[PDB]
């Protein structure tokens, strides 16, 4: 299974990936580029493309769209200023023809932080209810603990 994981910078995309691959919480640098890794979960081998979220790189995601079976969209639940921006990025991503049938999994992340928005709140802000054309799911996660990560891999594998 081919997976594209994106989201704004600092959402926790690489932390998520290497928690999944190494069971370890690594010390990230901003990703100017991608990381690509293969992860085994329950007889599925997920090839995850973690593509950096800062602006220059954001402009490049479209090259990773093609062949994508599922999309992990990571959100920093503690950052309320950038939630609209996330909504804007994700909405036009939903309009992409190469992403047309891909399974849509939102991770509301850093759920560990006291003022993190809830997954329900995030669902309203991102406009997730309005997707009728394909599968979507939202999952509260904490990438450092590992909470919600495998519930994500589970949902994804049931595409």
């Amino acid at each position: 299974m081919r997976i594209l994981m994106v989201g704004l910078d600092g959402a926790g995309k690489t932390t998520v990936l290497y928690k999944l691959k190494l069971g370890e919480v690594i010390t990230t640098i901003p990703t100017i580029g991608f990381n690509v890794e293969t992860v085994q979960y329950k007889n599925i081998s997920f090839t995850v493309w973690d593509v950096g979220g800062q602006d220059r790189i954001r402009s490049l995601w479209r090259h990773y769209y093609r062949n994508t079976e599922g999309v992990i969209f990571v959100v920093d639940s503690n950052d309320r200023s950038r939630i609209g921006e996330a909504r804007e990025v994700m909405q036009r991503m939903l309009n992409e023809d190469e992403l047309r049938n891909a399974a849509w999994l939102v991770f509301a992340n850093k759920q560990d932080l006291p003022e993190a928005m809830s997954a329900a709140e995030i669902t309203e802000k991102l406009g997730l209810h309005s997707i009728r054309n394909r599968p979507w799911f939202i999952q509260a996660t904490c990438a450092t603990s590992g909470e919600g990560l495998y519930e994500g891999l589970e949902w994804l594998s049931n595409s």
Binding site: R2, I32, G33, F34, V36, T47, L60, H63, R66, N67
Partner: protein, 126 residues
């Protein structure tokens, strides 16, 4: 020997999911052949082939690594959004064996520009 259009085109599959070190390495050999035999690449297809190859750097095989160094230098100037390949070259460059070591520094440094200069320095000093 070859046709530049067909070979530049079929390279675009790398950009998607297929990585197939054998097939891609061959396709790369063909690129080097088009230049060597004496031909001139077409820019759209070249630009496309360049973005595709960077995915191929994930798989670490000494022949595929080799193809990748010559092909990116030749295709570097007739290609766009080449910057993505720096990381992949550093990853290769630190990997011990002369096949990677020497050929990568040369391919990396050619593509590398003053912004990118800083990145290559630890690996360069070594």
């Amino acid at each position: 020997h070859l046709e530049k259009s067909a070979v530049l085109q079929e390279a675009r599959v790398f950009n998607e999911t297929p990585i197939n070190p054998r097939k891609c390495a061959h396709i790369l050999t063909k690129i080097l052949y088009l230049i060597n035999q004496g031909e001139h690449l077409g820019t759209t297809e070249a630009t496309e082939a360049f973005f595709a190859m960077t995915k191929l750097f994930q798989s670490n095989d000494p022949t595929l690594r080799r193809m990748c160094y010559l092909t990116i230098k030749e295709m570097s100037c007739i290609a766009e959004d080449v910057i993505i390949v720096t990381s992949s070259l550093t990853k290769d460059m630190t990997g011990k064996e002369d096949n990677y070591r020497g050929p990568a520094v040369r391919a990396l440094c050619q593509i590398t520009d003053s912004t990118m200069l800083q990145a290559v320095e630890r690996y360069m000093k070594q």
